[PDB]
Design a protein around this ligand. Structure first.
Ligand code: NAG
Ligand code: NAG
Ligand code: NAG
Ligand code: NAG
Ligand code: NAG
Ligand code: NAG
Ligand code: NAG
Ligand code: NAG
Ligand code: NAG
Ligand code: NAG
Lengths: 414, 147, 198, 50
C-alpha cells in the first residue's frame, strides 16, 4: 500500500459566463429609412416585428434574471470587518479595502481591466438604424457588494448562514471541521497551523501572477462580448444589399420610378431585411439558451461550493474540496477553489486483518500498516501511525478463513 | 470631399452628407427622430400618469434631439424643467417622476439600479416616484477567537 | 473526419480502467496510490454502510458473482439490438438531413425550371434575372433551415456530453452517494467503454 | 421491521451520445455550381454564406 506523508494546499481558478448584453431593435427605422411610403408597404406584412420585439424583450428580461439568480443568495449583506486576524489567514486580497478608491477588491479590480468591453464609427451606424443596447439592471457596485457580503460571512460565520441564521465560530475551528470533513483527523491542522496559513497566503498571491502576466485565461468570458459586437456589425452591413433590386437605397428607387413600378422592387428589399432580422433573432435565442444553461451551472456551483462543502468528485477544484471564494467579473463570475492534495508517498506492507488468538480483528477508519519492525494502524490520507488497541479494532467472526490474514497481538489497556 | 464628390455614403449605405449645388458647402443628414424613448406607466385602470425616459442623451439638450419647436403641444411639458421633475440618471433621465432617497424593493425596473413605483408616503398620492433599489440590510456580525 | 481516432479513445478508456483497479479512485485527486483490490472493495463496502466483514468472509462468492454478472452483458448485448437506439438515431438523423437537402435542388420555386442551364439557354439576360432570383432565394432558405436545425441538435448534444462528462468524473474515478445517478442499487464502481459517437 | 439476510451484485449498462458528425458546405457550388452568370448575382445578396 502507498500512504502519503505530506500535503499541499492549492487554489484553482475557473470562469464561466452568467449573462450577456441586452439589445433592442426598431423595425420602422431598420426596414425603412423614415420613408412614409415605405411604412405603409411594411404595414401590410402582419405582426412579424411584434414577434421580434417580444423575443428580444424576453431575452433582455432573462439576462437580468440570470444575474439575479447567481449572486443574490443571502438577502442580508454583512459588514466587512476592519481586522483580518483569522488565525494567520490573509483575506485582504479578496475583500474590499478600507478607504478604497474603487468599491471592489483587488483581484476583481485586476480582472476588470483584463477584459475589454469596447470618424466612421460603427456605433453611429448602429444608432441611426434602430440598434440600441440597454444597460443592465444591477450595476457592478451591487455585484461587488454581494460578493463582499458572501466573503465576509463565509469567513466569520462558516457555511451555516446559507441554511438558517448565521452562527459565530472561530476560523481555526471551522478549518478543523472542514479537515475532518475531508477524512483526515483534526490533528494535522492544530499542529501545523502556521504552515497552513503561510501556504494559503502565497497560494492566494500566485493567482495575481497567474492572472496578470498570462493572457488567454478569460477567453471564454471575452468571446461572449465579442460575439454580440460581431453579430451587430454584420447586421448593419446587410443594408447595402440589392436583394435583386436595382439599388440598395430606397431613395434611388422612389425618385427614379413611378408608384406602380415601385412596390415590385421595394418588396425585395423588405423581404431581405426581414429575413436578416429573423436570422439575428434566431441566433440571439440560441445564444440566450446557452447562456441560461451556463448561468444555472454557475448558480448551483455558488449554492453548493460557497455556502457549503461538497463531497462530489471534481466539482470545485482538482483535489479534496475545502471552500470557495466568489469574485465578480464583467458578464460572469470567477471561483477560487481551495483544495487539499497529498504530495509525497511511501511504500508500506499491509494486511487485511489480524488474528490474535483465534479471532479476527478488523480496523475502523484506517488500515494496518507496519513500518519495518512491528505493525501499526493509520488513516489513509495521512501517515499518522497509532498503536493497535482494542478500541481501534472490533472482534467479528473467526480468523480461520480470511485471505491474507497475519498473526499479531492486540493491546488491552486493562 | 473630393472635388467631384456630390454626396457621401455610410457603411450601411445611406447618405449622411451632401454638397449644396448653389453654394459649395457641406451639410450633414441625420434622422429627425433617432434614439430610444421609453414610457413608464402604472396600469390604465389606475390613474393615468406617465414618465418619459430618454435612453442615452444628456438632459440639458432634450429639446435639441426631440425638436420641440414642431412637436405637439402636450409634448412640451415632457421636455422642460419648469417643474422639479427632470433629474439625470445613469441610463438617461426621467421626466414626470420625482426622486426619493429611501430605498425600496424594485417594482418597475428602469436600469442602472433605479426602479419606479406608484404612490409615496410623503403630499403625493398619484405621482410616481423613482428610487434606488435595495439589495438587503446591514447586519454587521462580530468576530471573536473564542466565541 | 474527427480529430480523435477510435484507437486513442480506446487507449483513454484502457488507461482509466487500468488505474481504477490497480490504484483505486485516488489517482484522479492527486497522484496514484497503490492499494490491493480486496481492500479497495472493502473500503467501498464500508462506504455503502455495511461493515467490511461481509466481503472478507464471502470474497469467493463476490468474485464468482461479479465474473458472471459481467458475462451476462455479453448475452444482453449480442442478442438484443434495441439498447443502442439512442446511439443509432444520432447517426440516422445526419444522413436523413443531408439526403433531404440534396433533393431540394429539384424544385422550381415558382420558376420555369429547376435547372439553371434551361433558363440561361432559353432566355436573354433581362428576364432570366427574375426567374433566377427565385431559385437563389429558395436554395438560400433551404440552407438556412438546415443550419438552424444543426445548431439546435448541437445544443442538445452539448447538454448530453456535459452530462456524460460529469457522470465520468463522479462515477468512474469516484464513489457517488447520490440516489440513482449511476445504477439502481448502491453504487460501488463504474467502468467506461468506448462507443461510436458515445 | 424488515432486514435483508442476503444480497446480489448487478451490472447496469447505460448509453448516451457525446458528439455528432462534422459537416461543411460550399454555397458557390450548391446554389449555382459552375455557372458564372449567377455567381455575380449571389454576390449581390450580402454575407449570408459567411
Ligand atoms: C511538507 O511540505 C512543506 C512544503 O514544501 C514543507 O515545508 C514541510 O516541511 C513538509 N513536511 C515534511 C514532514 O517534510
Ligand atoms: C496581507 O497581505 C498584505 C498585502 O500587501 C500585506 O501588506 C499584509 O501584511 C498581509 N497580512 C495582514 C495580516 O494583513
Ligand atoms: C514503491 O515501490 C515501487 C515499485 O514497487 C517504486 O517504483 C517506487 O519508487 C517506490 N516508492 C518509493 C517512495 O520508494
Ligand atoms: C518503527 O516504529 C517504532 C515505534 O515508533 C520505532 O521504534 C522503530 O524504530 C521504527 N522503525 C523504522 C524502520 O522506522
Ligand atoms: C498463526 O498461528 C497459528 C498457531 O498459533 C498457526 O497455525 C498459523 O499458521 C499462524 N499464521 C501465520 C500466518 O503464521
Ligand atoms: C447661383 O445663383 C445664386 C443666385 O444669385 C447665387 O447666389 C449663387 O452664388 C450662384 N452659385 C454659383 C454661381 O455657383
Ligand atoms: C379596476 O380595478 C378595480 C379593482 O380591482 C375593479 O373593480 C375594476 O373593475 C377595474 N376596472 C375595470 C375597467 O376593469
Ligand atoms: C453629458 O454631461 C457630462 C457631464 O456634464 C459630460 O461629461 C458628457 O460628455 C455629456 N455628454 C454629451 C453627449 O454631451
Ligand atoms: C436626498 O439626497 C440628496 C443627495 O444626497 C440630498 O441633497 C437631499 O437633501 C436628500 N433629502 C431630500 C429630502 O431630498
Ligand atoms: C445468497 O445468494 C447467493 C446467490 O444465490 C447464494 O449462493 C448464497 O448461498 C445466498 N446466501 C445464503 C445465506 O443463503
Amino acid at each position: 500500500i502507498a500512504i502519503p506523508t505530506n500535503f499541499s494546499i492549492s487554489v484553482t481558478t475557473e470562469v464561466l459566463p452568467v449573462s450577456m448584453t441586452k439589445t433592442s431593435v426598431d423595425c420602422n427605422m431598420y426596414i425603412c429609412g423614415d420613408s412614409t411610403e415605405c411604412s405603409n408597404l411594411l404595414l401590410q406584412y402582419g405582426s412579424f416585428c411584434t414577434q421580434l420585439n417580444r423575443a428580444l424583450s424576453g431575452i433582455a428580461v432573462e439576462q437580468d434574471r440570470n444575474t439575479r439568480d447567481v449572486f443574490a443568495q443571502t438577502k442580508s449583506i454583512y459588514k466587512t470587518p476592519n481586522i483580518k486576524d483569522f488565525g494567520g489567514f490573509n483575506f485582504s486580497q479578496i475583500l474590499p479595502d478600507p478607504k478604497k478608491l474603487s468599491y471592489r477588491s483587488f483581484i476583481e479590480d485586476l480582472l476588470y481591466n483584463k477584459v475589454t468591453l469596447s470618424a466612421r464609427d460603427l456605433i453611429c451606424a448602429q444608432k441611426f438604424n434602430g440598434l440600441t443596447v440597454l444597460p443592465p439592471l444591477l450595476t457592478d457596485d451591487m455585484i461587488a457588494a454581494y460578493t463582499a457580503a458572501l466573503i465576509s460571512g463565509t469567513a466569520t460565520a462558516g457555511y451555516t448562514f446559507g441554511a438558517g441564521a448565521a452562527l459565530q465560530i472561530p476560523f481555526a475551528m471551522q478549518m478543523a471541521y472542514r479537515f475532518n470533513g475531508i477524512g483526515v483527523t483534526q490533528n494535522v491542522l492544530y499542529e501545523n497551523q502556521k504552515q497552513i496559513a503561510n501556504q494559503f497566503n502565497n497560494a492566494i498571491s500566485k493567482i495575481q501572477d497567474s492572472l496578470t502576466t498570462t493572457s488567454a485565461a478569460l477567453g471564454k468570458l471575452q468571446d461572449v462580448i465579442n460575439q454580440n459586437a460581431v453579430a451587430l456589425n454584420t447586421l448593419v452591413k446587410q443594408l447595402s444589399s440589392n436583394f435583386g433590386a436595382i439599388s440598395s437605397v430606397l431613395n434611388d428607387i422612389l425618385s427614379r420610378l413611378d408608384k406602380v413600378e415601385a412596390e415590385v422592387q421595394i418588396d425585395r428589399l423588405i423581404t431581405g431585411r426581414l429575413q436578416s432580422l429573423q436570422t439575428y433573432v434566431t441566433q440571439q435565442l440560441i445564444r440566450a439558451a446557452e447562456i441560461r444553461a451556463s448561468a444555472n451551472l454557475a448558480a448551483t456551483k455558488m449554492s453548493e461550493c460557497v455556502l457549503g462543502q461538497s463531497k462530489r468528485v471534481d466539482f470545485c477544484g482538482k483535489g479534496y474540496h475545502l471552500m470557495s471564494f466568489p469574485q465578480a467579473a464583467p458578464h460572469g463570475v470567477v471561483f477560487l477553489h481551495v483544495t487539499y492534495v497529498p504530495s509525497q508517498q511511501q511504500n508500506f506492507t499491509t494486511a487485511p486483518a489480524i488474528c490474535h488468538n483465534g479471532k479476527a480483528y478488523f480496523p475502523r477508519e484506517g488500515v494496518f500498516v507496519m513500518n519495518g519492525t512491528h505493525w501499526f494502524i493509520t488513516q489513509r490520507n495521512f501517515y499518522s501511525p497509532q498503536v493497535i488497541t482494542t478500541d481501534n479494532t472490533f472482534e467479528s467472526g473467526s480468523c480461520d478463513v480470511v485471505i491474507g490474514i497475519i498473526n499479531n497481538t492486540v493491546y488491552d489497556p486493562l | 470631399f473630393q472635388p467631384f464628390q456630390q454626396f457621401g455614403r455610410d457603411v450601411s449605405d445611406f447618405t449622411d452628407s451632401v454638397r449644396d449645388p448653389k453654394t459649395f458647402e457641406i451639410l450633414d443628414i441625420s434622422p429627425c427622430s433617432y434614439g430610444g424613448v421609453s414610457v413608464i406607466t402604472p396600469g390604465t385602470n389606475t390613474s393615468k400618469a406617465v414618465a418619459v425616459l430618454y435612453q442615452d442623451v444628456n438632459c440639458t439638450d432634450v429639446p435639441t434631439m426631440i425638436h420641440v419647436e414642431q412637436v405637439s403641444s402636450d409634448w412640451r411639458v415632457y421636455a422642460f424643467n419648469s417643474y422639479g421633475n427632470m433629474f439625470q440618471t445613469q441610463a438617461g433621465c426621467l421626466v414626470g417622476a420625482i426622486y426619493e432617497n429611501t430605498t425600496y424593493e424594485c417594482d418597475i425596473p428602469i436600469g442602472a439600479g433605479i426602479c419606479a413605483k406608484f404612490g409615496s408616503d410623503k403630499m403625493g398620492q398619484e405621482s410616481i416616484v423613482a428610487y434606488t433599489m435595495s439589495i438587503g440590510e446591514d447586519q454587521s456580525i462580530a468576530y471573536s477567537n473564542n466565541i
